[PDB]
């Protein structure tokens, strides 16, 4: 975790989600620390919703 890449790399794209607003990415962001053995997990719902909120 301690500067991994997969893990920074995790909360870095949770933050460089354009279509999430502060609410949303911030609780991925939590969900992340609370868990970081569901690091994937919860980028891949980040991801999820960041696209289903696409404009296009």
Known sequence: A???E????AFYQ???????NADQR???IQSLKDDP????????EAQ???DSQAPK
């Open 2 to 4: 301690q500067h991994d």
């Open 6 to 9: 997969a893990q920074q790399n």
């Open 14 to 20: 949770v933050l460089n989600m354009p279509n999430l």
């Open 26 to 28: 911030n609780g991925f």
């Open 37 to 44: 053995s569901q690091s994937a997990n919860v980028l891949g």
């Open 48 to 50: 999820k919703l960041n």
